[PDB]
Amino acid sequence: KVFGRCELAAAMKRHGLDNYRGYSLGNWVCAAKFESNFNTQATNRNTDGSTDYGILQINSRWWCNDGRTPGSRNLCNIPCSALLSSDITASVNCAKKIVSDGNGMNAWVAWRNRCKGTDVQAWIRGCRL
């Protein structure tokens, strides 16, 4: 599913991301846009053989199991497919673990290079939240 901006903001808010580990909701919307263009079905392979999955491009070397990333972990205890769902639950729950891990949102490269330090409230402007 390809979310609207406002529609994903609202889903993220319902699943408890707003101000999660101190990251306001616009952070999370901005990272979804630049990671996946709001597309729950985005995948992208990496040079290391791992793949990034779903709306927040979560990586198979550490976080989910895809059966084709040797030696990798599965810290979110889930199949990487389960992150491509129209229901964002699994993606949020796993993102909460990632943002906990020490590096905050810097885990997400496109957050760091396209959202950090910018006017991220813009991403929720106009939204009935």
Residues with active-site annotation: 35, 52
In this chain, which stretch among 13-21, 74-82, 95-103, 119-127 interacts with Na ion, using CB under 5 A? 74-82
Smallest gap from residue 43 Cβ to Na ion (A): 14
Residues binding Na ion: number (CB under 5 A):
5
x-marked contacts with Na ion along 30-69 as a string, rule CB under 5 A? ------------------------------x----x---x
HSE toward the beta carbon, residue 89, CA cutoff 13 A: 3
Q: For residue 27, state whether it binds Na ion (rule: CB under 5 A).
A: no
Instruction: Please give the span between the terminal C-alpha atoms of the chain, in angstroms, as a whole number.
Output: 21
Residue that has been written with the tokens 């999370």 in this structure: 28
Asked if residues 112 and 105 have their Cβ atoms less than 8 Å apart, the reply is yes
Residue that has been written with the tokens 């999955």 in this structure: 53
CB atoms within 10 A of CB 113: 10
Smallest gap from residue 12 Cβ to Na ion (A): 24
Give the annotated binding-site residues for substrate.
101
